[PDB]
Amino acid sequence: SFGFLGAAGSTMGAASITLTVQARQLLSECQQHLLQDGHWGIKQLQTRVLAIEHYLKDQQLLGIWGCSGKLICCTAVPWNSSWSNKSHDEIWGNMTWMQWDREISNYTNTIYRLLEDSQNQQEQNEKDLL
Amino acid sequence: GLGAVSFGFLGAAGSTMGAASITLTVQARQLLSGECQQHLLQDGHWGIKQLQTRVLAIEHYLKDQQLLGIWGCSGKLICCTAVPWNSSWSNKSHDEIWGNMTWMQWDREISNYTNTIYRLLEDSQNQQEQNEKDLL
Amino acid sequence: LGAVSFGFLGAAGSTMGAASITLTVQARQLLSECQQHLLQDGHWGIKQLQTRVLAIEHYLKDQQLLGIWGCSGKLICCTAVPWNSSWSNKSHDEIWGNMTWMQWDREISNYTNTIYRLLEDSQNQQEQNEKDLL
Amino acid sequence: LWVTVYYGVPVWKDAETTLFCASDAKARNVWATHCCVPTDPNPQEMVLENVTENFNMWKNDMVEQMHEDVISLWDQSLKPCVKLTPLCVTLECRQVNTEEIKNCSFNATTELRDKKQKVYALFYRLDIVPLEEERKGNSSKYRLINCNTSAITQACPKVTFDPIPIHYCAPAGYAILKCNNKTFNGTGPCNNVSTVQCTHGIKPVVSTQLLLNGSLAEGEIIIRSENLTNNVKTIIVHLNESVEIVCTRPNNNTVKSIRIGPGQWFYYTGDIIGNIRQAYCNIKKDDWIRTLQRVGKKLAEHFPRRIINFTQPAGGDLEITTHSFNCRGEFFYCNTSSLFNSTYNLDITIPCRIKQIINMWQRVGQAMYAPPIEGNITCKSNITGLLLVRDGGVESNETEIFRPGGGDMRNNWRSELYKYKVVEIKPLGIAPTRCKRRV
Amino acid sequence: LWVTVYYGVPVWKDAETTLFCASDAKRNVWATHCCVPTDPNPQEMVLENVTENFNMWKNDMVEQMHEDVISLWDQSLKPCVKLTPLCVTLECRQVNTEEIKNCSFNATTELRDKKQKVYALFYRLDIVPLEEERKGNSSKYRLINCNTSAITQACPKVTFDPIPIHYCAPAGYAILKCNNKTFNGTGPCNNVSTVQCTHGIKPVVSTQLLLNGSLAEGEIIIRSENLTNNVKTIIVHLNESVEIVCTRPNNNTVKSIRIGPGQWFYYTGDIIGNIRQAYCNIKKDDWIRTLQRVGKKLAEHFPRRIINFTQPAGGDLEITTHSFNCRGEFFYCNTSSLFNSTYLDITIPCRIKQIINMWQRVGQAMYAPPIEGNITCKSNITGLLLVRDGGVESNETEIFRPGGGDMRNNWRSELYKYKVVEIKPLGIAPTRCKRR
Amino acid sequence: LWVTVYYGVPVWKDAETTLFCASDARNVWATHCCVPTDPNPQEMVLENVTENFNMWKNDMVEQMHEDVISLWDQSLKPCVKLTPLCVTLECRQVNEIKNCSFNATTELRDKKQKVYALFYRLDIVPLEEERKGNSSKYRLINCNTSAITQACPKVTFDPIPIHYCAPAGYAILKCNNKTFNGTGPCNNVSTVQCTHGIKPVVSTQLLLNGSLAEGEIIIRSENLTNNVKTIIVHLNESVEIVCTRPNNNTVKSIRIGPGQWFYYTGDIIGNIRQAYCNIKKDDWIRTLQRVGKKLAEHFPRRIINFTQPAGGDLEITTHSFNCRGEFFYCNTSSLFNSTYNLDITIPCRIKQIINMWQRVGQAMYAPPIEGNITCKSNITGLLLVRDGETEIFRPGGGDMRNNWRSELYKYKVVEIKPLGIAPTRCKRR
Ligand SMILES: *[C@@H]1O[C@H](CO)[C@@H](O[C@@H]2O[C@H](CO)[C@@H](O[C@@H]3O[C@H](CO[C@H]4O[C@H](CO)[C@@H](O)[C@H](O)[C@@H]4O)[C@@H](O)[C@H](O[C@H]4O[C@H](CO)[C@@H](O)[C@H](O)[C@@H]4O)[C@@H]3O)[C@H](O)[C@H]2NC(C)=O)[C@H](O)[C@H]1NC(C)=O
Ligand SMILES: *[C@@H]1O[C@H](CO)[C@@H](O[C@@H]2O[C@H](CO)[C@@H](O[C@@H]3O[C@H](CO[C@H]4O[C@H](CO)[C@@H](O)[C@H](O)[C@@H]4O)[C@@H](O)[C@H](O[C@H]4O[C@H](CO)[C@@H](O)[C@H](O)[C@@H]4O)[C@@H]3O)[C@H](O)[C@H]2NC(C)=O)[C@H](O)[C@H]1NC(C)=O
Ligand SMILES: *[C@@H]1O[C@H](CO)[C@@H](O[C@@H]2O[C@H](CO)[C@@H](O)[C@H](O)[C@H]2NC(C)=O)[C@H](O)[C@H]1NC(C)=O
Ligand SMILES: *[C@@H]1O[C@H](CO)[C@@H](O[C@@H]2O[C@H](CO)[C@@H](O)[C@H](O)[C@H]2NC(C)=O)[C@H](O)[C@H]1NC(C)=O
Ligand SMILES: *[C@@H]1O[C@H](CO)[C@@H](O[C@@H]2O[C@H](CO)[C@@H](O)[C@H](O)[C@H]2NC(C)=O)[C@H](O)[C@H]1NC(C)=O
Ligand SMILES: *[C@@H]1O[C@H](CO)[C@@H](O[C@@H]2O[C@H](CO)[C@@H](O)[C@H](O)[C@H]2NC(C)=O)[C@H](O)[C@H]1NC(C)=O
Ligand SMILES: *[C@@H]1O[C@H](CO)[C@@H](O)[C@H](O)[C@H]1NC(C)=O
Ligand SMILES: *[C@@H]1O[C@H](CO)[C@@H](O)[C@H](O)[C@H]1NC(C)=O
Ligand SMILES: *[C@@H]1O[C@H](CO)[C@@H](O)[C@H](O)[C@H]1NC(C)=O
Ligand SMILES: *[C@@H]1O[C@H](CO)[C@@H](O)[C@H](O)[C@H]1NC(C)=O
Ligand SMILES: *[C@@H]1O[C@H](CO)[C@@H](O)[C@H](O)[C@H]1NC(C)=O
Ligand SMILES: *[C@@H]1O[C@H](CO)[C@@H](O)[C@H](O)[C@H]1NC(C)=O
Ligand SMILES: *[C@@H]1O[C@H](CO)[C@@H](O)[C@H](O)[C@H]1NC(C)=O
């Protein structure tokens, strides 16, 4: 995921356009010695296991919201002016993803709960269409 | 953790299947989302024991997700299928199964037929896969 | 666990067509103490974990590609990328009837990354089209 | 009518898994160094309504894991400590003037390999094996006990083994079920089952006949045994009111130390400032008598039409006949024959011996040396349960003979883990519904 | 026309991965490890019309077996008595009744201020003289390899008997076996099958003859990385075994002393009766027919040359004799009487050693304690390790002398038919169906 | 209007992790740091990105400290122990170095051998009064504290450049702002996968090798007004210092056990001479004039006095370094003897028994090397301690983290957070 940070400081809108195409492309004998020397092998295993756990937690979270298999996914939850009173022209222009992330860092749990409730309603509707 | 790993999924034990299912549909999403570094995992075998525990938990999670994928149930918590219910697996009525019965009792009752049911689910998805290929 | 069962082999000796007709027929069925000495009593404890961890990473990488290509949850998935005769100019019936999967894999190995990039671009366009359904 | 797949089903199956240890975050203590994961304040506990579960106090893998963890922590704690192999030398001993303690002298090693030092030390007779017939008043030759069997490792004086409460916690994906039935006998169904993440705090107290500093029974005295008819199995009388026992070593010791080799210090008792006294314990007399009478009553109910006779253990090595325990780092071996002296349904003084060379868990080959502590030692504990062994056989005069048990440490830890079971969550299930997927 | 993605494609690629060891169900080694039970009635799936390229040399399964054997050996010896306290001057004399000497020494005891006088019988091959010998009735000697390193006593309660073991691939990998007989070890195999685990392989250690191995399905097969290059060892696989019976005809009385807390030292105390040389008996007619057949097969590869089987050039016993472990005793048999031909038993003199430097590792010596009574064992000779002399000048002859070296040519004699591959289930192919 | 979930968002959070060591494709630093590094490695400049860096409380320094100690100990572990040599030594004058005899062990437990060896006085502790004539009894230093382990003569610790690399999912941010101090925002930040090559050079007062400042001399301190903090000075020009041991040592060896070889200095062929270093005088003078000027800017209206350190243990008052395996303790008092408003010869002592990393016990013995020793270093920085109208600055150090911090001051480790949420105009429908 290293190359993703190349979009840092891109006014978000440009960053969004850049990710639309680039994110998909970005996602797609001596070394064994230290694996048996002291505790270096254990530290490497902890690093690899933790990386797997974080990847799977993010994929699970996307699955819960009904966004699995997508890179950019629209939901049915409306935006609340309480979370941010900036217009979409400011959020998507003259604002970076780091600034936005800080701007709503304390509303993440509210949005996540709303996404979970929205998916419960959708899944129900799918069951009802049958 | 990963998967249905929380006490909120263990409570409602002893409760009627219909009630546990109703609770599930309004709680599962909320539940799924939620100097030790010097003494432990160094100079001892706690490192291996905890890594084995974490790796095993990952393997069990992925195994269950693979089974849901194979059956065409990916991304859902309650997935309807196209396999008819066989009276040879259980001859109890719909109301008796969903009312006046817990999930532990049901799981014990049909344990012996679990693998048979799984094979049928796999076959059902293969038929659905062919239909997707044909309608193109 | 992934497509790791031994029963995935044996069709290697069959043509691509004959082996392909075994997928969606057998593939889903195939996908389906002393341990205190082997582990925690030498470096075997680490070697075994590395094998298990490595197997998981390979499984997840294959699943990631299926996700990227829009092929998640399927065993056979058709895409929107046309076949280029530059990669191989053998006829459809010749490829499916007179070749095995091993020989086929060798014939287009040098174009695999090219094809994968096209698959990514195809899914990218499809994702935009979904957004455009508004 | 149609098969429906449900994920997140409240179903579980019995399973074994490695548990992790946690303790109070608010603090040398081996147990505090391990079990470093802090526990939650006000931990979660949930009651499962209308759930019956079959529990089995015996064949509980939590006990085997606790047993191995205790042994492993003790073995690791002694790993970097001073080895006393250089002290396996001819030792010349005379009696101390103002049988149990002898004034021994030996030629110990020093920092330099070409120099020896003359060391005088007081040793207990139980830590010494004679080489030649002894003579009163003469410098008879002796050697340290267990020298021929294996090396003796000195416990590090900086390392503290004092028990603290610890909690065993399930890894993610598993849950610990607890039986809340106050009269549960340890086996069979329990009709009040709650789920916890971690067990309550358990103190890893090591004792042989009496269970100290444990939990009290919620109800009346509970008699638990794998099989009461089979007198081979040990019985674990849990008590609903503790009995206070105070133990002491009334000897004002002066402790000296020497170097054995580079960076390696050996600690030994140098002298005794006052007189030489026998160690002892005092158990409140009225509480002991009431406790034993109540136990006799319960046993009489379990063994009807019999006289319940409590007697002393049969003669044998101290480790299997006396009440051993660790009192602030020193190992006491108290003779409890004056307590188990009743016939049927102000304090009591128990003589105690003290040893410095300990063969823990009856493992031949791994001896440790317990350094002395200066001054006199006092401690006090709560007796919360008993380990009893029944002697049936002939059953003379239609009586049953009960004796103190011990010798297998898992019985002490089982006494706390009897109410816990570890299960695996199985969230994927199938049930008939009236909904079908569109073709 | 259109690209289709398939998962589960029967395609694999060569890969190097760790293979776990599994032994048949029902102390020791090779059983404490390799605990994993094998499947009863294991499956093998023949791949029809499949040709694969095999190479028995540069086979990673051999390197893994090599490292597992050494690692297990060292782990087995680790928790055992060290004999460092016995590196003392020995005073040895001729045994009352020069291969065995009666040596007196002052050994340590559990008390560090006391020593004990010990008499023991040692083989001359385990002792290095310090003084000129035959002086008076005794002379000063030292144990061999004391200057080089510490000598560790093998634990007397643990046996190294080579029970069969099986190597199994981890999930996602498969082991391909070559079924075609007469395969020379390299190149394509036209009949292959897929297995999860290898057959049972006995970790037998020897230097010139391969014992208790597999027999060739057909004829005698001569396998060598490059027959032209005399540096490479030639492995001869026989289709018939030759019976060899080996014995140590000496009724030993074994004594033991304590040399430290919990440290018991075992040594030969006395010999009841007279002293006799150890020996092996190899059936004469089976050996002669076997050697004639090997000479014939070599003649087919070295035409217009005389096939001369001769003895190894003189040197250290470890590279000139046939070494083997017979119930814990280490035999070094002089086989020059067997390789004495040019294309009723044959008795082979054998020497016995107690201090063994295994796998040519200088610095890690091991002491094999004696067994009381006499030792007899029997084995099946299933192959040979031959080294061609390869002198540029010879009178139209080729000389084949017995040679071993790496145990790695012993394990190649069993693993030559196996390859480890990784399954690659994801692939693409053209179709006529568009995603739409 | 509607919530949209994006994956792959270029957002990161501060995080701690374990970095792996890699090097450009024996030497303990080459045995470890197994992963080859890329040639011409990638650096991606982040435009219009400001980030907060802190030279102190940087977990990369604590990791490097732990890794260096762990590697050192693992390298010495499989080596000859010198416990058998804790015997009484009888030492006489050769004509700082004494001719000491002792009865050493042999491969046989019933035989000892007489060994004559030369030892430095700093490695010898007296047991009795020292006589000018005859001989006196002494013992090896630290014998009463711990066993002494001999460094393996075939294993070298000579530092080579190493690179610390992030595991996947993490990235290293580098501050490209020249003349940047610690604890503050950096307005020119680039993202890298691995750090530049860092040499694990061990020294106590001068930083003998490493990167030079791209700008002017930079004075960095956690709290410059706090007189208990160490000030790290990064120079923009190096000063050449050449160190040597002019002693034609003849090295002898004996066995002290099975396979256990002990190496010691047998004789000196020529004259006995003191070891020394020569640092260019003009470069040193300009260096201190520039440092004094910058300190005066940081400490206005004060005179800057560069003085020698206060008396104390040799290990904390001298400039220590490893020159081809030999440990030099150079008395740099002639270098810090000046006030701000061809060669300078520094006498040096040599030790063989080294207590590393400020630990008690675990002493190491450094075998001697035959012939004379020379090495040349580029002094790149200084470790100064203020005493707290005249300010006094003295050489100081010994906390090894400050040397490694002097290289890691520009790197930060961050974790990538690929998820984010933003409003859109498109509803899921
Ligand atoms: C059942 O449970 C009881 C209660 O928990 C246990 O009894 C306690 O045991 C602990 C540990 O042995 C005792 O703690 C010790 O107290 C010593 C001081 O006692 C008195 O003296 C000082 C003045 O010198 C007073 O200030 C103090 O208040 C007391 O009146 C300490 O000196 C000991 O410290 C030693 O260990 C610690 C460990 O960290 C080191 O840090 C110290 O440096 C030193 O080495 C120790 O703390 C406690 O007093 C006991 N309580 C009672 C009421 O007696 C039983 O032992 C337990 N049963 C069993 C079988 O273990
Ligand atoms: C090629 O393969 C052959 C066949 O396996 C090997 O030869 C065998 O080797 C084994 C092990 O070295 C021999 O087994 C030993 O036999 C001894 C004699 O057995 C007599 O007494 C027993 C008593 O039960 C009778 O059953 C038996 O019939 C004989 O009457 C035993 O005393 C040995 O037991 C000792 O060791 C075991 C090790 O676990 C201990 O458990 C025992 O308590 C005891 O201490 C042992 O069982 C076997 O006899 C050999 N067979 C033949 C025909 O010779 C070859 O060695 C092998 N080739 C090579 C190179 O290794
Ligand atoms: C032994 O039991 C007594 C009670 O019988 C315990 O004493 C009480 O301890 C609690 C703390 O948990 C205090 O709040 C009470 O005030 C105490 N009561 C009395 C009368 O002392 C004692 O703590 C127990 N000891 C052990 C080691 O468990
Ligand atoms: C512990 O259990 C005993 C019985 O096993 C209880 O003793 C009883 O106490 C009541 C109090 O009124 C008496 O009437 C009974 O006669 C007692 N029974 C016996 C056999 O003595 C005791 O009270 C219990 N204590 C606690 C704290 O639960
Ligand atoms: C290819 O090899 C396989 C296995 O070695 C051969 O199959 C065996 O054939 C014999 C009959 O001669 C049977 O008794 C065995 O049971 C078969 N084994 C298996 C695993 O199938 C096969 O015949 C060989 N084919 C050729 C052409 O050589
Ligand atoms: C390192 O540089 C930073 C600026 O990026 C200094 O921080 C502040 O500088 C202002 C003046 O511009 C002072 O008024 C503040 O008091 C400083 N803040 C703090 C927390 O110090 C910082 O002082 C510099 N540090 C050093 C040692 O020079
Ligand atoms: C945010 O949403 C809540 C309901 O979820 C609503 O009550 C609240 O008024 C909203 N905020 C604003 C500023 O309208
Ligand atoms: C348990 O049973 C009682 C009575 O039948 C009922 O009221 C209660 O709700 C049940 N428990 C649960 C969790 O439903
Ligand atoms: C296309 O066909 C020609 C024969 O005319 C052949 O030489 C060439 O290899 C083919 N190309 C591919 C990609 O198969
Ligand atoms: C415990 O109670 C059960 C009844 O639920 C009984 O079957 C079992 O034998 C009892 N066990 C003991 C040891 O009393
Ligand atoms: C208990 O021991 C007796 C001994 O006679 C035996 O008959 C009985 O079967 C045992 N109980 C169980 C449950 O095994
Ligand atoms: C065998 O070795 C000889 C060495 O003289 C070499 O010339 C020949 O090419 C080798 N054969 C093969 C097949 O490599
Ligand atoms: C070896 O001992 C056995 C014991 O029965 C005996 O039969 C055999 O003849 C002995 N062999 C020799 C060569 O002494």
Please spell the DSSP secondary structure of E86-107, one letter per residue.
Answer: G-S-EEEEEPP---EEEEEEEE
Q: Looking at chain A, how many residues does it have? A: 130
Neighbours of chain E (3+ CB pairs under 8 A): B, C, D, F
CA distances from E154 to E73, E165, E329, F347 (A): 10, 22, 12, 56
Q: Show the 3-state SS of E269-311.
A: EEEECCCCCEEEEEEHHHHHHHHHHHHHHHHCCCCCCEEEECC
CATH at residue E292: 2.170.40.20
> What token pair was written down for B99?
């009312």
Please give the C-alpha separations between residue E382 and each of D400, E214, E300, in angstroms, as whole numbers.
69, 7, 21
Alpha carbon C27 to chain centroid, angstroms:
12
Q: Which of E103, E120, E145 is the last residue of a domain?
A: E145
HSE-up of residue C10 (Cα within 13 Å, Cβ side): 14
Find all residues with CB under 8 Å of D405, minimum gap 6, and list them. D209, D234, D235, D387, D388, D389, D411
Count H helices and E strands in chain D, helices first: 5, 30
Closest-lying ligand 6 atom to the alpha carbon of residue F182 = 1
Burial (CB count within 10 angstroms: exposed 0-12, middle 13-18, buried 19+), residue E316: exposed
Q: Name the residue type at position D355.
A: K
CA-D225 nearest atom, ligand 10: 13
Does some domain include residue C94?
A: yes
Give the C-alpha separation, E429 to C16, whole Å: 9
Is D399 in the same domain as D305?
yes
Give the number of residues written for chain C: 134
Q: Where are the beta strands (DSSP E) in chain A?
A: 72-78
Distance of CA B57 from the midpoint of ligand 11 (Å): 40
The protein residue whose alpha carbon is closest to atom 14 in ligand 11 is D227
Cβ–Cβ gap E436/B133 under 8 Å: no
Contact of A130 with chain D, judged by CB distance below 8 Å, is answered with: yes
D229 with D364, same domain: the answer is yes
Contact C131/F at CB under 8 A: yes
D396 inside domain: yes
D16 falls within a domain: no
Count: domains in chain B: 1
Does D432 map to a domain? Answer: no
> Could you tell me which residues come within 8 angstroms of residue E193 by beta carbon, excluding any fewer than 6 positions away?
E44, E45, E46, E47, E176, E177, E179
Please, which residues bridge with residue F194 across strands? F165
Q: Name residue D104's beta-bridge partners.
A: D93, D121
Task: Read off the tokens for F142.
Answer: 């630290």
* Co-location of F100 and F208 in the same domain: no
**Cβ atoms E239, D126 nearer than 8 A:** no
A34: in domain: no
Which residues between 13 and 52 in chain C have a beta carbon less than 8 angstroms from any beta carbon of chain B? Answer: 24-25, 28-29, 31-32, 39-40, 45-46, 49, 52
Residues 6+ apart with CB under 8 A from C54: none
Task: With respect to residue B16, please indicate whether it lies within any of the assigned structural domains.
Answer: yes
Q: What angle (nearest 5°) sits at the alpha carbon of residue E327, between those of residues E323 and E332? A: 20
DSSP summary character for residue D216:
P
Q: Residue E236 has which token pair?
A: 């001869």
Q: Considering only CA atoms, which of F119, F195, F190 is closest in space to residue F162?
A: F195
Task: Give the relative orientation of helices D61-78 and D410-417 as an angle to the nearest 10 degrees.
Answer: 130
Angle at B60 between CA B54 and CA B65, to 5 degrees: 125
Q: To test ligand 12's pocket by mutation, which of E57, E186, E223, E228 has the most ligand atoms within 8 angstroms of CB?
A: E228
Is ligand 3 within 6 A of the CB of residue D195? no
Chains in touch with A (≥3 Cβ pairs < 8 A): B, C, D, F
Name the DSSP letter for residue E169.
P
Question: Strands, DSSP E only, in D201-329?
Answer: 210-212, 235-261, 264-272, 279-284, 307-310, 323-327
Burial of residue E229 (number of CB atoms within 10 Å: 0-12, 13-18, 19+): exposed
CB count, 10 Å around CB of E135? 9
Resolution (A): 3.3
Residue ending a domain, among D125, D146, D167, is D146
Quick check: F173 and F386 in contact, CB under 8 A?
Answer: no
Residues contacting residue F66 through CB under 8 Å, at least 6 positions apart: none
Same domain, E322 and E223: yes
Domain range spanning residue A44? 2-28+40-129
Of F49, F421, F426, the CB nearest to A8: F49
Q: A88–F425: do the CB atoms touch at under 8 Å?
A: yes
**Chain C interface includes F427 (CB < 8 A):** yes
Residue F380, classed as helix, strand or coil, is: strand
Question: Residue C31 falls within a domain, yes or no?
Answer: yes
CB of D160 closer than 6 A to ligand 1? yes
3-state secondary structure of C41: coil
Answer whether B82 sits within 8 Å of D439, measured CB to CB: yes
Dist CA A98 CA A103 (whole Å)? 9
Report if residue A13 sits inside a domain.
yes
Are D394 and D306 contained in the same domain?
A: yes
Helix (H, G, I), strand (E, B) or coil at D87: helix
Of F267, E122, B41, the C-alpha closest to A50 is: B41
Among chain E residues, the shortest Cα distance to F254 is held by: E147
* Contact between D7 and B78 using a beta-carbon 8 Å cutoff: yes
Residue F106 Cα to chain centre, angstroms: 37
Q: After which residues is chain A broken (C to N over 2.5 A)?
A: 28
Tokens of E253: 């009385």
A90 assigned to some structural domain: yes
DSSP letter (8 states) at residue E125: G
Phi, psi of D370 (to 5 degrees): -95, 115
Maximum C-alpha span of chain F:
103
Contact E434 B136 (CB under 8 A): yes
Give the total number of structural domains in chain F: 3
Q: Alpha-carbon distance B76 to A123, whole Å?
A: 8
Rg (CA), chain C: 20
β-sheet bridge partners, residue F70: none
Q: Note every long-range contact of A52-56, with CB atoms under 8 Å and residues 24 or more positions apart, other chains counting.
A: A52/B58, A52/C53, A52/C56, A52/C57, A52/C60, A53/B2, A53/B54, A53/B58, A54/F169, A55/C60, A55/F169, A56/B2, A56/B58, A56/B61, A56/B62, A56/C60
Return d(Cα F27, Cα F158) in angstroms, integer. Answer: 7
Residues 267-296 of E with CB under 8 A from C: none
E409: closest CA among E163, E65, E34, E15? E65
Query: Domain for residue B52, yes or no?
Result: yes
Picking from C2, C41, C78, the nearest residue to E431 by CB comes out as: C78
Nearest to B29 by CA among A63, A73, D11, A68: A63
E53 in a structural domain: no
Contacts of C12 (CB under 8 A, 6+ apart): C19, C100, C101, C102, E10, E11, E12, E47, E50
Distance D17 CA to ligand 10 centre (A): 27
**Residue that the structure tokens 């817990």 belong to:** B102
Residue C1 lies in a domain: no
Q: Which of B26, B41, B54 sits opposite A42 (nearest CB)?
A: B41
Give the structural domain span for D382: 207-252+275-408
**Listed residues E145, E166, E184: the one ending a domain:** E145
**Which C residues in the span 80-99 are in contact with E, Cβ-Cβ below 8 Å?**
80-83, 88, 92, 95-96
> Residues F22, F37: contact at Cβ < 8 Å?
yes
Q: CB contact, 8 Å: A73 with chain B?
A: no
Query: Cβ(E374) to ligand 13 under 6 A?
Result: yes
Answer for the pair E375, E247: CB distance below 8 angstroms, yes or no: yes
